[PDB]
């Protein structure tokens, strides 16, 4: 059976499967997880099979760059052929919980009596349906203040209906700004650009045409398109050097598979042919 342990979500199932038969985070404590998971091969992230190979495997690829964003962390793992490249790969601190928490504060300022503890899951879903980053602020704010269509209605569990407009794009943004974040980054896009650029100069174009997304945090609508637009501007800005012509030539493609939410699991499951005795292998089972 394939078990994919994530910080905020555990995907376990069988082989040559489809989607996890179970998606439930495990409650020493890791050993405790066995009691509620196994009871009524192994997968390891870049601290047996490197998920980068896995995510890519399910895609029928060996080379490429994997952008995996989950609950606790976000990585950019470039995989060359079968193996991964433990050296290029970079990490994003940037976050799910924080945005959900920020959306709650923003809705509170609007005048909705939300509680950070009691309503955390409810607002998480409003973020999971309405609320993510935008290309620019001044334009977004105009759309929010000038058309009705920002301004989307959302039915709370008790039947009341609230409205969400500018906060839809306002929550990612803290995180961007250096102002409020008090740390200096990029993002994710600029982070992706650097990873590929700092790589070779031959299979670099190879990576660019095989960027694959994985994890739930990569399911917010428009992400793939935003990444592309940001990469085209970054390419234009640096390697292209402002030449209109050098743009037409470039090859760009961000693979965003429908079942990318659990792309690691989907991979992992059908990797895994059966050894006849389980029995004899391990030291312990030995």
């Amino acid at each position: 059976v394939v078990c994919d342990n994530g910080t905020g979500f555990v995907k376990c199932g069988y082989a040559g499967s489809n989607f996890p038969e179970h998606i439930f985070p495990a409650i020493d404590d890791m050993k405790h997880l066995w009691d509620y998971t196994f009871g009524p091969l192994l997968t390891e992230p870049p601290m047996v099979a490197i998920q980068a190979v896995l995510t890519l495997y399910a895609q029928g690829l060996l080379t490429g760059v994997v952008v995996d964003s989950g609950d606790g962390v976000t990585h950019i793992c470039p995989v060359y052929e079968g193996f991964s490249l433990p050296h290029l790969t970079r990490r994003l601190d940037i976050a799910g919980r924080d945005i959900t928490r920020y959306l709650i504060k923003l809705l509170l300022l609007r005048g909705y009596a939300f509680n950070h503890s009691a309503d955390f899951e409810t607002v998480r879903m409003i973020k999971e349906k309405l609320c993510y980053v935008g290309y620019n602020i001044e334009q977004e704010q105009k759309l929010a203040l000038e058309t009705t269509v920002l301004v989307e209605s959302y039915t709370l569990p008790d039947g009341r209906i609230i409205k969400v407009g500018g906060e839809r794009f306002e929550a990612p943004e803290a995180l961007f700004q250096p102002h409020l974040i008090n740390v200096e980054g990029v993002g994710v896009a600029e982070l992706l650009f650097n990873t590929i650029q700092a790589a070779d100069i031959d299979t670099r174009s190879e990576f660019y045409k095989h960027i694959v997304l994985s994890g739930g945090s990569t399911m917010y609508p428009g992400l793939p398109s935003r990444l592309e637009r940001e990469l085209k501007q970054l390419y234009l800005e640096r390697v292209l050097k402002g030449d209109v012509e050098k743009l037409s030539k470039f090859k760009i493609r961000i693979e965003d598979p429908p079942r990318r939410k659990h792309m690691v699991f989907l991979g992992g499951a059908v990797l895994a042919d059966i050894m006849k005795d389980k029995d004899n292998f391990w030291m312990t089972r030995q």
Binding site: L109, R110, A113, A118
Partner: protein
């Protein structure tokens, strides 16, 4: 600047009004406007409010603020007109305004209020505060507190519906507020019935009037019903009182006896079966339950600082009896705990002070006397340049 910002606290029954810096309100007036039966015009200009608006009976009394919500916005707007130009006598362009509001008002209602204040009265600055937060701040003047904190539990009982609200850092936790139906008015009706069935010679159409006075003059909380009943049945000469009012009809004096209602009136919270038949469940458990619905991590300070607001809380020894009963409920839960079973249970207090009656107004005056108030207000220029985002939200 130079002047004290106007503080207007529009309540369900009584509106508290005055100028910042003052210890007590300059007016306490009934929150209904007596109107005729549009009427442009001369019909317009004609109005009464307070005592005048009440006084004629015939000419219909409205609740300009009922449940903390404006009944009709047009009539509420007219109310604010005379509140400013007849009673306060403030030139509105020279005074910042502090208004107050009850929890659960929607942002739309806030924009309607601000629209009125800015587009009609051209005020230089406006702040709309939630009643509970200033009332908590108002309690910082009490000797029983030594350090300032803006985390606590407010028991807001008005004349329409009492609300129990835990508040953390200035924002009401909307999902944990609870309402209890019963208020000053229920007390009046039941005691009214109580007098009708026992005392004789009381003309019906002025029954409430009399009723209000007896409650205002003789009601109290007793510690135990049966011992107290025995007290009245034993030492009647120094426990039974007499009240004398004048009959609004025939201009003659009526004298009534005042007995059991004295302790039975305020008693009714305590045993909720009193007040309505539907209320199974006492005040100690509801307040405890409310506190128990908020995050466990923040259930430390809330138990240490329960503050009272509104007149319905000015009955002698209300807080003491409440504190005892709550201690019994908390101790019983931690008793169950221990047996099943550690960390020690937090001490439980109820803050009382001398300004409990209109704690809300007092808090308004105290905050509006500081420079910060001038810092956080919305200016008319910002209203014009930004529009409607600004006035909905609190100061950055």
């Amino acid at each position: 600047g130079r002047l004290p910002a106007c503080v207007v606290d529009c309540g369900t029954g009584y509106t508290k009004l005055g100028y910042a810096g003052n210890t007590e309100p300059q007016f306490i007036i009934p929150s209904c406007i007596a109107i005729k039966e549009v009427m442009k015009g001369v019909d317009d200009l004609d109005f009464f409010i307070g005592d005048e608006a009440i006084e004629k009976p015939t000419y219909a009394t409205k609740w300009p603020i009922r449940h903390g919500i404006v009944e009709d916005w047009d009539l509420m707007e007219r109310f604010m007109e005379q509140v400013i130009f007849k009673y306060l006598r403030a030139e509105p362009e020279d005074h910042y305004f502090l208004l107050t509001e009850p929890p659960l008002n929607t942002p739309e209602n806030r924009e309607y209020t601000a629209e009125i204040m800015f587009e009609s009265f051209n005020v230089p600055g406006l702040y709309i505060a939630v009643q509970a937060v200033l009332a908590l701040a108002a309690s910082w003047t009490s000797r029983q507190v030594g350090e300032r904190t803006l985390t606590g539990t407010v028991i807001d009982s008005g004349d329409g519906v009492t609300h129990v609200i835990p508040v953390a850092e200035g924002y009401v936790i909307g999902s944990c507020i609870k309402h209890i139906p019963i208020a000053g008015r229920d007390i009046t009706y039941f005691i009214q019935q109580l007098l009708r069935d026992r005392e004789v010679g009381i003309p019906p159409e002025q029954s409430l009037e009399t009723a209000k006075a007896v409650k205002e003059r003789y009601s109290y909380v007793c510690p135990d019903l049966v011992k107290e009943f025995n007290k009245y049945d034993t030492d009647g000469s120094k426990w039974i009182k007499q009240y004398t009012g004048i009959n609004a009809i025939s201009k003659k004096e009526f004298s009534i006896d005042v007995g059991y209602e004295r302790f039975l009136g305020p008693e009714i919270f305590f045993h909720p079966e009193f007040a309505n038949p539907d209320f199974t469940q006492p005040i100690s458990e509801v307040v405890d339950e409310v506190i128990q619905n908020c995050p466990i991590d923040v259930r430390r300070p809330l138990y240490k600082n329960i503050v009272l607001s509104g007149g319905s809380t000015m009955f002698r020894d209300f807080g003491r009896r409440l504190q005892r009963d709550l201690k019994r409920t908390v101790d019983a839960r931690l008793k169950l705990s221990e047996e099943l079973s550690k960390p020690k249970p937090i001490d439980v207090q109820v803050i009382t002070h001398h300004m409990q009656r209109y704690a809300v107004w007092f808090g308004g005056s105290m905050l509006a006397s500081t420079p910060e108030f001038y810092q956080v207000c919305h200016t008319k220029k910002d209203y014009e340049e930004i529009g409607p985002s600004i006035c909905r939200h609190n100061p950055v």
